Amino acid sequence: VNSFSGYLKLTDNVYIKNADIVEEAKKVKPTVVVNAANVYLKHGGGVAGALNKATNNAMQVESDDYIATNGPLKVGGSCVLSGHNLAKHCLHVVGPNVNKGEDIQLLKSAYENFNQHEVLLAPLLSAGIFGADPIHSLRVCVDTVRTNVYLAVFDKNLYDKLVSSFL
Ligand SMILES: C[C@H](Cc1ccco1)C(=O)N[C@H](CC(=O)O)c1ccc2c(c1)OCO2
């Protein structure tokens, strides 16, 4: 038993809700919140900008030190950093950004990072400003992630669509 509420169950291990991931995180304090990161950990907009703003820019400060020490992430890769006031940990995961021409097949590799964590609150990778089809992203999520994932979808309209078209 865990503290997530109001989720619709899609599969044995995948759950979905129309919610703002920022407010969802401040209420659950999940062990892991996933950020829709880029390779530079520049949290300017989308989910990343919203999460970072909710940390009063502490996420960005920590991220800049990480990059200065380690260099950029790989597309499809991830790193674990602090969750600040939102979660114990933040798993920064880089899905491919279609608006940069990145290979969509890397979306499966990106979701594989979720399997290193027993339970996660997460957005749909490569959705939103990353330009992928959220329905394809949901399919890859369901077919790749084996751990327990709670997907927060900000847009109510999108959410209804994802549910109604789910196979
Ligand atoms: C089709 C809709 C358009 C839309 C955007 C906002 C409302 O509708 C869409 O791309 N949605 C994705 C996925 C989602 O809805 O979780 C998304 C991603 C990041 C976000 C985000 C929304 O909003 C805040 O950061």
Short mmCIF file of N, CA and C and ligand atoms in Angstrom, two decimals:
data_model
loop_
_atom_site.label_atom_id
_atom_site.label_comp_id
_atom_site.label_asym_id
_atom_site.label_seq_id
_atom_site.Cartn_x
_atom_site.Cartn_y
_atom_site.Cartn_z
N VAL A 1 0.83 -1.20 0.00
CA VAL A 1 0.00 0.00 0.00
C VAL A 1 0.87 1.25 0.00
N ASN A 2 0.53 2.21 -0.86
CA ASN A 2 1.22 3.50 -0.93
C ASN A 2 0.18 4.63 -0.93
N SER A 3 0.68 5.87 -0.95
CA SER A 3 -0.13 7.07 -0.68
C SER A 3 -0.75 7.76 -1.92
N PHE A 4 -0.52 7.28 -3.14
CA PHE A 4 -1.11 7.85 -4.36
C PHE A 4 -2.63 7.65 -4.39
N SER A 5 -3.38 8.69 -4.80
CA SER A 5 -4.84 8.67 -4.75
C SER A 5 -5.44 9.15 -6.07
N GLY A 6 -6.59 8.56 -6.46
CA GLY A 6 -7.32 9.04 -7.61
C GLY A 6 -6.77 8.56 -8.92
N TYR A 7 -5.82 7.59 -8.85
CA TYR A 7 -5.23 7.07 -10.08
C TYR A 7 -6.14 6.02 -10.71
N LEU A 8 -6.21 6.04 -12.03
CA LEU A 8 -6.80 4.96 -12.80
C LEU A 8 -5.71 3.94 -13.10
N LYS A 9 -6.04 2.66 -12.91
CA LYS A 9 -5.09 1.57 -13.13
C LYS A 9 -5.17 1.18 -14.63
N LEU A 10 -4.04 1.24 -15.38
CA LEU A 10 -3.99 0.82 -16.78
C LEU A 10 -3.54 -0.63 -16.91
N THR A 11 -2.55 -1.03 -16.13
CA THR A 11 -1.99 -2.38 -16.15
C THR A 11 -1.64 -2.80 -14.73
N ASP A 12 -0.99 -3.96 -14.62
CA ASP A 12 -0.53 -4.44 -13.33
C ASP A 12 0.30 -3.39 -12.60
N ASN A 13 1.09 -2.60 -13.35
CA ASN A 13 2.09 -1.73 -12.73
C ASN A 13 2.02 -0.26 -13.15
N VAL A 14 1.14 0.12 -14.07
CA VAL A 14 1.05 1.48 -14.58
C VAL A 14 -0.30 2.08 -14.20
N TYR A 15 -0.24 3.29 -13.63
CA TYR A 15 -1.39 4.06 -13.17
C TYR A 15 -1.31 5.46 -13.79
N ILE A 16 -2.45 6.12 -13.98
CA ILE A 16 -2.48 7.42 -14.64
C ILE A 16 -3.55 8.32 -14.01
N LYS A 17 -3.27 9.63 -14.00
CA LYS A 17 -4.16 10.63 -13.41
C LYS A 17 -3.97 11.95 -14.15
N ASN A 18 -5.06 12.72 -14.30
CA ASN A 18 -4.98 14.11 -14.73
C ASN A 18 -4.55 14.94 -13.53
N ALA A 19 -3.30 15.39 -13.53
CA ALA A 19 -2.75 16.13 -12.41
C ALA A 19 -1.54 16.92 -12.86
N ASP A 20 -1.29 18.00 -12.13
CA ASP A 20 -0.05 18.77 -12.20
C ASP A 20 0.99 18.04 -11.35
N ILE A 21 2.04 17.53 -12.00
CA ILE A 21 3.07 16.76 -11.30
C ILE A 21 3.69 17.54 -10.15
N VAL A 22 3.78 18.87 -10.26
CA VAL A 22 4.32 19.69 -9.16
C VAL A 22 3.44 19.57 -7.91
N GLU A 23 2.13 19.80 -8.04
CA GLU A 23 1.28 19.66 -6.86
C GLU A 23 1.19 18.23 -6.41
N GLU A 24 1.14 17.30 -7.35
CA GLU A 24 1.13 15.91 -6.93
C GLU A 24 2.35 15.58 -6.08
N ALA A 25 3.54 16.02 -6.49
CA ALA A 25 4.76 15.78 -5.72
C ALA A 25 4.69 16.44 -4.34
N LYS A 26 4.30 17.69 -4.23
CA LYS A 26 4.34 18.28 -2.89
C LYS A 26 3.41 17.60 -1.88
N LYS A 27 2.38 16.89 -2.34
CA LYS A 27 1.44 16.22 -1.45
C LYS A 27 1.85 14.80 -1.09
N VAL A 28 2.42 14.05 -2.02
CA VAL A 28 2.81 12.67 -1.75
C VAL A 28 4.21 12.59 -1.14
N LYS A 29 5.10 13.49 -1.51
CA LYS A 29 6.50 13.43 -1.14
C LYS A 29 6.99 12.06 -1.60
N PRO A 30 6.79 11.72 -2.87
CA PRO A 30 7.17 10.36 -3.24
C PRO A 30 8.67 10.17 -3.07
N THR A 31 9.06 8.90 -2.99
CA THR A 31 10.48 8.57 -2.96
C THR A 31 11.20 9.10 -4.20
N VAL A 32 10.58 8.98 -5.37
CA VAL A 32 11.17 9.39 -6.65
C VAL A 32 10.13 10.16 -7.46
N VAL A 33 10.48 11.38 -7.86
CA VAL A 33 9.80 12.10 -8.92
C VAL A 33 10.72 12.14 -10.14
N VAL A 34 10.16 11.87 -11.31
CA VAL A 34 10.90 11.93 -12.57
C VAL A 34 10.78 13.31 -13.18
N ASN A 35 11.91 13.87 -13.58
CA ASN A 35 11.96 15.09 -14.37
C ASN A 35 12.18 14.77 -15.84
N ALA A 36 11.46 15.50 -16.70
CA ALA A 36 11.65 15.50 -18.14
C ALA A 36 12.82 16.41 -18.48
N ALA A 37 14.02 15.87 -18.31
CA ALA A 37 15.26 16.62 -18.43
C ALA A 37 15.77 16.67 -19.86
N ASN A 38 16.68 17.62 -20.11
CA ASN A 38 17.55 17.60 -21.29
C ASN A 38 18.97 17.26 -20.85
N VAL A 39 19.85 17.03 -21.82
CA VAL A 39 21.19 16.52 -21.52
C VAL A 39 22.01 17.51 -20.71
N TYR A 40 21.67 18.79 -20.77
CA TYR A 40 22.40 19.84 -20.05
C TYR A 40 21.80 20.12 -18.68
N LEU A 41 20.71 19.45 -18.33
CA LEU A 41 19.96 19.74 -17.11
C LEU A 41 19.63 21.23 -16.98
N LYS A 42 19.27 21.85 -18.09
CA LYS A 42 18.80 23.23 -18.08
C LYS A 42 17.28 23.21 -18.00
N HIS A 43 16.76 23.52 -16.81
CA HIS A 43 15.35 23.28 -16.49
C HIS A 43 14.52 24.53 -16.79
N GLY A 44 14.38 24.82 -18.07
CA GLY A 44 13.82 26.11 -18.47
C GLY A 44 12.32 26.16 -18.66
N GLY A 45 11.71 25.04 -19.02
CA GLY A 45 10.30 25.03 -19.32
C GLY A 45 9.75 23.63 -19.31
N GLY A 46 8.47 23.52 -19.63
CA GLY A 46 7.80 22.25 -19.51
C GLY A 46 7.78 21.77 -18.08
N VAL A 47 7.78 20.44 -17.93
CA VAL A 47 7.83 19.82 -16.60
C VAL A 47 9.07 20.29 -15.85
N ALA A 48 10.23 20.32 -16.51
CA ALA A 48 11.47 20.66 -15.80
C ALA A 48 11.42 22.08 -15.26
N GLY A 49 10.97 23.03 -16.07
CA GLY A 49 10.88 24.39 -15.59
C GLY A 49 9.93 24.52 -14.43
N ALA A 50 8.80 23.81 -14.49
CA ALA A 50 7.84 23.85 -13.41
C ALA A 50 8.39 23.22 -12.13
N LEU A 51 9.02 22.03 -12.24
CA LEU A 51 9.62 21.42 -11.06
C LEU A 51 10.69 22.33 -10.47
N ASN A 52 11.55 22.87 -11.33
CA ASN A 52 12.63 23.70 -10.83
C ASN A 52 12.09 24.95 -10.13
N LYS A 53 11.08 25.60 -10.73
CA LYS A 53 10.47 26.77 -10.10
C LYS A 53 9.93 26.44 -8.71
N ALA A 54 9.33 25.26 -8.56
CA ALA A 54 8.78 24.85 -7.27
C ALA A 54 9.87 24.64 -6.21
N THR A 55 11.11 24.35 -6.63
CA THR A 55 12.26 24.26 -5.71
C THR A 55 12.96 25.60 -5.49
N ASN A 56 12.40 26.70 -6.00
CA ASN A 56 13.01 28.01 -5.82
C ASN A 56 14.40 28.04 -6.48
N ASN A 57 14.58 27.30 -7.58
CA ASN A 57 15.81 27.23 -8.38
C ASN A 57 16.88 26.36 -7.72
N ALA A 58 16.61 25.71 -6.59
CA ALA A 58 17.63 24.84 -6.00
C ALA A 58 17.94 23.65 -6.90
N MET A 59 16.94 23.13 -7.61
CA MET A 59 17.20 22.06 -8.57
C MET A 59 18.22 22.50 -9.63
N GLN A 60 18.08 23.71 -10.17
CA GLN A 60 19.03 24.20 -11.18
C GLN A 60 20.43 24.35 -10.61
N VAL A 61 20.55 24.88 -9.39
CA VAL A 61 21.86 25.07 -8.77
C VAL A 61 22.55 23.72 -8.61
N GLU A 62 21.83 22.72 -8.10
CA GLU A 62 22.40 21.39 -7.94
C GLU A 62 22.78 20.79 -9.29
N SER A 63 21.91 20.99 -10.29
CA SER A 63 22.15 20.45 -11.63
C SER A 63 23.38 21.06 -12.27
N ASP A 64 23.58 22.37 -12.11
CA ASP A 64 24.74 23.01 -12.71
C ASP A 64 26.04 22.45 -12.13
N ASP A 65 26.06 22.19 -10.82
CA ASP A 65 27.23 21.55 -10.22
C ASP A 65 27.42 20.13 -10.77
N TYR A 66 26.33 19.38 -10.95
CA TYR A 66 26.43 18.03 -11.52
C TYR A 66 27.07 18.07 -12.91
N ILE A 67 26.61 18.98 -13.77
CA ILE A 67 27.14 19.06 -15.13
C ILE A 67 28.59 19.52 -15.13
N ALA A 68 28.92 20.49 -14.29
CA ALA A 68 30.30 20.95 -14.22
C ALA A 68 31.25 19.82 -13.85
N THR A 69 30.80 18.87 -13.03
CA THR A 69 31.63 17.74 -12.62
C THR A 69 31.61 16.60 -13.64
N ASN A 70 30.45 16.29 -14.22
CA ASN A 70 30.25 15.05 -14.97
C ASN A 70 30.04 15.23 -16.46
N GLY A 71 29.77 16.44 -16.94
CA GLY A 71 29.40 16.66 -18.32
C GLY A 71 27.96 16.26 -18.57
N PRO A 72 27.51 16.45 -19.81
CA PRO A 72 26.10 16.21 -20.14
C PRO A 72 25.71 14.75 -20.03
N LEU A 73 24.42 14.54 -19.82
CA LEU A 73 23.84 13.21 -19.93
C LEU A 73 23.79 12.79 -21.39
N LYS A 74 23.49 11.51 -21.61
CA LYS A 74 23.14 10.96 -22.92
C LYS A 74 21.63 11.08 -23.13
N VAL A 75 21.22 11.29 -24.39
CA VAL A 75 19.81 11.10 -24.72
C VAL A 75 19.46 9.65 -24.46
N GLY A 76 18.40 9.41 -23.68
CA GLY A 76 18.06 8.08 -23.22
C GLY A 76 18.59 7.78 -21.84
N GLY A 77 19.46 8.65 -21.30
CA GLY A 77 20.08 8.42 -20.01
C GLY A 77 19.41 9.18 -18.87
N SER A 78 20.02 9.07 -17.69
CA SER A 78 19.45 9.63 -16.48
C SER A 78 20.52 9.85 -15.43
N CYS A 79 20.15 10.63 -14.41
CA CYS A 79 20.92 10.72 -13.18
C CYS A 79 19.96 10.94 -12.02
N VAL A 80 20.38 10.50 -10.84
CA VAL A 80 19.63 10.69 -9.60
C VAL A 80 20.22 11.87 -8.85
N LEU A 81 19.40 12.86 -8.55
CA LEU A 81 19.79 14.00 -7.74
C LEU A 81 18.75 14.17 -6.64
N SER A 82 18.90 15.23 -5.84
CA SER A 82 17.96 15.49 -4.76
C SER A 82 16.56 15.78 -5.29
N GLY A 83 15.55 15.41 -4.50
CA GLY A 83 14.18 15.80 -4.78
C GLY A 83 13.79 17.11 -4.14
N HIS A 84 14.69 17.72 -3.38
CA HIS A 84 14.44 19.03 -2.74
C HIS A 84 13.16 18.94 -1.92
N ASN A 85 12.24 19.89 -2.05
CA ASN A 85 11.00 19.94 -1.30
C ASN A 85 9.90 19.11 -1.95
N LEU A 86 10.19 18.42 -3.05
CA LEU A 86 9.16 17.72 -3.81
C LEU A 86 9.14 16.21 -3.62
N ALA A 87 10.27 15.60 -3.27
CA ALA A 87 10.43 14.15 -3.25
C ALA A 87 11.74 13.87 -2.52
N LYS A 88 11.98 12.60 -2.16
CA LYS A 88 13.30 12.25 -1.65
C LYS A 88 14.36 12.47 -2.72
N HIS A 89 14.11 11.92 -3.91
CA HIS A 89 15.02 11.94 -5.04
C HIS A 89 14.30 12.43 -6.29
N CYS A 90 15.06 13.07 -7.18
CA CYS A 90 14.60 13.35 -8.53
C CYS A 90 15.42 12.53 -9.51
N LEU A 91 14.74 11.70 -10.30
CA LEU A 91 15.37 10.99 -11.40
C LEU A 91 15.20 11.84 -12.66
N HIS A 92 16.29 12.47 -13.08
CA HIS A 92 16.30 13.29 -14.29
C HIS A 92 16.50 12.34 -15.46
N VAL A 93 15.51 12.22 -16.34
CA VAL A 93 15.54 11.30 -17.47
C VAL A 93 15.43 12.09 -18.75
N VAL A 94 16.31 11.81 -19.71
CA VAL A 94 16.34 12.51 -21.00
C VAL A 94 15.65 11.64 -22.04
N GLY A 95 14.41 11.98 -22.34
CA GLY A 95 13.79 11.43 -23.51
C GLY A 95 14.26 12.17 -24.75
N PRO A 96 14.12 11.55 -25.92
CA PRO A 96 14.43 12.26 -27.16
C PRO A 96 13.49 13.44 -27.39
N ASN A 97 14.05 14.56 -27.84
CA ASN A 97 13.29 15.75 -28.18
C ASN A 97 13.09 15.78 -29.69
N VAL A 98 11.86 15.51 -30.12
CA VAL A 98 11.55 15.49 -31.55
C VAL A 98 11.85 16.84 -32.18
N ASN A 99 11.64 17.92 -31.44
CA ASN A 99 11.94 19.24 -31.97
C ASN A 99 13.44 19.51 -32.11
N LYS A 100 14.29 18.56 -31.70
CA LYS A 100 15.72 18.59 -32.01
C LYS A 100 16.12 17.52 -33.01
N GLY A 101 15.18 16.70 -33.48
CA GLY A 101 15.50 15.65 -34.44
C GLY A 101 16.04 14.37 -33.84
N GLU A 102 15.84 14.14 -32.55
CA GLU A 102 16.42 12.98 -31.89
C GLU A 102 15.60 11.73 -32.16
N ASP A 103 16.28 10.59 -32.15
CA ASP A 103 15.69 9.33 -32.59
C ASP A 103 14.71 8.85 -31.56
N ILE A 104 13.50 8.62 -32.03
CA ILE A 104 12.37 8.25 -31.17
C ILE A 104 12.58 6.89 -30.54
N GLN A 105 13.33 6.02 -31.17
CA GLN A 105 13.61 4.73 -30.58
C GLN A 105 14.32 4.87 -29.24
N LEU A 106 15.00 6.00 -29.00
CA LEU A 106 15.66 6.22 -27.72
C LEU A 106 14.64 6.39 -26.60
N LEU A 107 13.35 6.51 -26.93
CA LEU A 107 12.34 6.63 -25.89
C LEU A 107 12.29 5.36 -25.03
N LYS A 108 12.45 4.19 -25.63
CA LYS A 108 12.44 2.97 -24.83
C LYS A 108 13.62 2.95 -23.85
N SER A 109 14.82 3.31 -24.33
CA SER A 109 15.98 3.40 -23.45
C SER A 109 15.72 4.36 -22.29
N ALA A 110 15.07 5.49 -22.57
CA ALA A 110 14.77 6.45 -21.52
C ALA A 110 13.88 5.83 -20.44
N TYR A 111 12.81 5.15 -20.86
CA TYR A 111 11.92 4.52 -19.88
C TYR A 111 12.60 3.40 -19.10
N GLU A 112 13.61 2.74 -19.68
CA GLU A 112 14.29 1.67 -18.95
C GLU A 112 14.90 2.18 -17.65
N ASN A 113 15.26 3.47 -17.58
CA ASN A 113 15.80 4.01 -16.33
C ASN A 113 14.81 3.85 -15.19
N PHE A 114 13.51 3.86 -15.49
CA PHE A 114 12.51 3.76 -14.43
C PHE A 114 12.61 2.43 -13.68
N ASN A 115 13.12 1.39 -14.35
CA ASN A 115 13.16 0.05 -13.75
C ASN A 115 14.15 -0.06 -12.61
N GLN A 116 15.01 0.94 -12.42
CA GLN A 116 15.93 0.95 -11.30
C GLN A 116 15.28 1.45 -10.01
N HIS A 117 13.97 1.76 -10.04
CA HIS A 117 13.26 2.33 -8.89
C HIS A 117 11.92 1.62 -8.72
N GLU A 118 11.63 1.21 -7.49
CA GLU A 118 10.45 0.36 -7.25
C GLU A 118 9.15 1.10 -7.51
N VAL A 119 9.11 2.39 -7.17
CA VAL A 119 7.91 3.23 -7.32
C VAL A 119 8.33 4.63 -7.76
N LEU A 120 7.61 5.21 -8.73
CA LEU A 120 7.93 6.54 -9.24
C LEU A 120 6.67 7.31 -9.57
N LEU A 121 6.73 8.62 -9.35
CA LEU A 121 5.80 9.60 -9.91
C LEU A 121 6.47 10.19 -11.14
N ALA A 122 5.78 10.23 -12.28
CA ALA A 122 6.49 10.58 -13.49
C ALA A 122 5.54 11.24 -14.49
N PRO A 123 6.08 12.02 -15.42
CA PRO A 123 5.33 12.49 -16.57
C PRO A 123 5.56 11.52 -17.73
N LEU A 124 4.83 11.73 -18.80
CA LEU A 124 5.10 10.95 -19.98
C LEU A 124 6.34 11.49 -20.69
N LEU A 125 7.35 10.64 -20.81
CA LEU A 125 8.61 11.08 -21.39
C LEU A 125 8.43 11.46 -22.85
N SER A 126 9.14 12.51 -23.24
CA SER A 126 9.15 13.05 -24.59
C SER A 126 7.83 13.68 -25.00
N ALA A 127 6.84 13.79 -24.09
CA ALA A 127 5.59 14.48 -24.36
C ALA A 127 5.78 16.00 -24.26
N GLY A 128 4.68 16.73 -24.33
CA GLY A 128 4.74 18.18 -24.15
C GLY A 128 5.72 18.79 -25.13
N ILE A 129 6.56 19.70 -24.62
CA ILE A 129 7.47 20.45 -25.48
C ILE A 129 8.55 19.58 -26.11
N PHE A 130 8.69 18.32 -25.69
CA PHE A 130 9.64 17.43 -26.35
C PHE A 130 9.09 16.85 -27.66
N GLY A 131 7.81 17.07 -27.97
CA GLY A 131 7.32 16.90 -29.32
C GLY A 131 6.86 15.52 -29.74
N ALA A 132 6.97 14.51 -28.87
CA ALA A 132 6.50 13.19 -29.25
C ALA A 132 4.99 13.06 -29.04
N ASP A 133 4.43 12.03 -29.64
CA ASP A 133 3.01 11.72 -29.46
C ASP A 133 2.84 11.12 -28.07
N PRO A 134 2.07 11.75 -27.18
CA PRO A 134 1.90 11.17 -25.83
C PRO A 134 1.27 9.79 -25.83
N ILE A 135 0.40 9.48 -26.79
CA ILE A 135 -0.15 8.13 -26.88
C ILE A 135 0.97 7.10 -27.17
N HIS A 136 1.88 7.37 -28.15
CA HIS A 136 3.04 6.49 -28.33
C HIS A 136 3.88 6.40 -27.07
N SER A 137 4.12 7.53 -26.41
CA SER A 137 4.90 7.51 -25.18
C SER A 137 4.26 6.61 -24.13
N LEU A 138 2.94 6.68 -23.99
CA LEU A 138 2.25 5.82 -23.02
C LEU A 138 2.42 4.35 -23.38
N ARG A 139 2.33 4.01 -24.68
CA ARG A 139 2.50 2.63 -25.11
C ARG A 139 3.91 2.13 -24.76
N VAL A 140 4.93 2.94 -25.05
CA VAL A 140 6.30 2.53 -24.73
C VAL A 140 6.46 2.37 -23.23
N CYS A 141 5.89 3.30 -22.46
CA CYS A 141 5.94 3.19 -21.00
C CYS A 141 5.39 1.84 -20.54
N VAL A 142 4.18 1.51 -20.98
CA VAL A 142 3.53 0.28 -20.54
C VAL A 142 4.33 -0.95 -20.96
N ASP A 143 4.94 -0.91 -22.15
CA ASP A 143 5.69 -2.05 -22.68
C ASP A 143 7.14 -2.11 -22.19
N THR A 144 7.60 -1.14 -21.41
CA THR A 144 9.00 -1.07 -20.99
C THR A 144 9.18 -1.07 -19.48
N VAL A 145 8.37 -0.30 -18.76
CA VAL A 145 8.50 -0.16 -17.32
C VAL A 145 7.81 -1.33 -16.64
N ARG A 146 8.53 -1.98 -15.74
CA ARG A 146 8.04 -3.10 -14.96
C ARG A 146 7.83 -2.74 -13.49
N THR A 147 8.40 -1.64 -13.02
CA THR A 147 8.19 -1.16 -11.67
C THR A 147 6.91 -0.33 -11.64
N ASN A 148 6.52 0.12 -10.45
CA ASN A 148 5.22 0.77 -10.28
C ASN A 148 5.34 2.26 -10.60
N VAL A 149 4.66 2.68 -11.66
CA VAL A 149 4.76 4.05 -12.15
C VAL A 149 3.39 4.72 -12.11
N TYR A 150 3.37 5.90 -11.51
CA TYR A 150 2.20 6.77 -11.37
C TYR A 150 2.41 7.96 -12.29
N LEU A 151 1.67 7.98 -13.40
CA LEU A 151 1.83 8.98 -14.44
C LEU A 151 0.89 10.15 -14.19
N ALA A 152 1.47 11.35 -14.04
CA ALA A 152 0.73 12.59 -13.88
C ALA A 152 0.66 13.30 -15.23
N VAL A 153 -0.55 13.54 -15.70
CA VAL A 153 -0.80 14.20 -16.98
C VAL A 153 -1.47 15.53 -16.70
N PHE A 154 -0.78 16.63 -17.01
CA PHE A 154 -1.26 17.96 -16.64
C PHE A 154 -2.55 18.33 -17.37
N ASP A 155 -2.64 18.02 -18.66
CA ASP A 155 -3.75 18.48 -19.49
C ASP A 155 -4.93 17.52 -19.42
N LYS A 156 -6.07 18.02 -18.93
CA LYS A 156 -7.24 17.16 -18.76
C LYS A 156 -7.70 16.58 -20.10
N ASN A 157 -7.72 17.40 -21.14
CA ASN A 157 -8.11 16.92 -22.46
C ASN A 157 -7.21 15.78 -22.93
N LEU A 158 -5.90 15.93 -22.74
CA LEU A 158 -4.97 14.90 -23.19
C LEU A 158 -5.21 13.61 -22.49
N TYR A 159 -5.39 13.73 -21.22
CA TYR A 159 -5.66 12.62 -20.34
C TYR A 159 -6.85 11.79 -20.83
N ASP A 160 -7.97 12.46 -21.14
CA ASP A 160 -9.16 11.74 -21.58
C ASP A 160 -8.87 10.99 -22.85
N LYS A 161 -8.00 11.58 -23.60
CA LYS A 161 -7.70 10.97 -24.87
C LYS A 161 -6.84 9.73 -24.72
N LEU A 162 -5.87 9.83 -23.87
CA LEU A 162 -4.98 8.71 -23.57
C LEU A 162 -5.76 7.53 -23.01
N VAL A 163 -6.70 7.80 -22.12
CA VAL A 163 -7.51 6.74 -21.52
C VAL A 163 -8.39 6.08 -22.57
N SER A 164 -9.11 6.89 -23.36
CA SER A 164 -10.10 6.38 -24.31
C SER A 164 -9.46 5.58 -25.43
N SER A 165 -8.21 5.88 -25.77
CA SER A 165 -7.52 5.19 -26.86
C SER A 165 -6.59 4.09 -26.37
N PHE A 166 -6.56 3.82 -25.06
CA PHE A 166 -5.61 2.86 -24.50
C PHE A 166 -6.02 1.43 -24.85
N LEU A 167 -5.08 0.65 -25.38
CA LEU A 167 -5.37 -0.74 -25.69
C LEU A 167 -4.85 -1.64 -24.57
C1 LIG B 1 -1.19 17.97 -25.93
C2 LIG B 1 -0.84 18.70 -24.64
C3 LIG B 1 -0.90 20.21 -24.82
C4 LIG B 1 -0.94 20.87 -23.44
C5 LIG B 1 0.16 21.36 -22.73
C6 LIG B 1 -0.40 21.89 -21.52
C7 LIG B 1 -1.78 21.69 -21.64
O1 LIG B 1 -2.03 21.09 -22.77
C8 LIG B 1 0.56 18.28 -24.21
O2 LIG B 1 1.48 18.44 -24.93
N1 LIG B 1 0.70 17.71 -22.89
C9 LIG B 1 1.99 17.26 -22.39
C10 LIG B 1 1.77 16.00 -21.56
C11 LIG B 1 0.83 16.25 -20.39
O3 LIG B 1 -0.27 16.83 -20.57
O4 LIG B 1 1.18 15.89 -19.23
C12 LIG B 1 2.65 18.24 -21.43
C13 LIG B 1 3.99 18.08 -21.13
C14 LIG B 1 4.61 18.94 -20.25
C15 LIG B 1 3.87 19.97 -19.66
C16 LIG B 1 2.53 20.12 -19.95
C17 LIG B 1 1.91 19.25 -20.85
O5 LIG B 1 2.03 21.23 -19.23
C18 LIG B 1 3.03 21.57 -18.30
O6 LIG B 1 4.23 20.98 -18.74
#
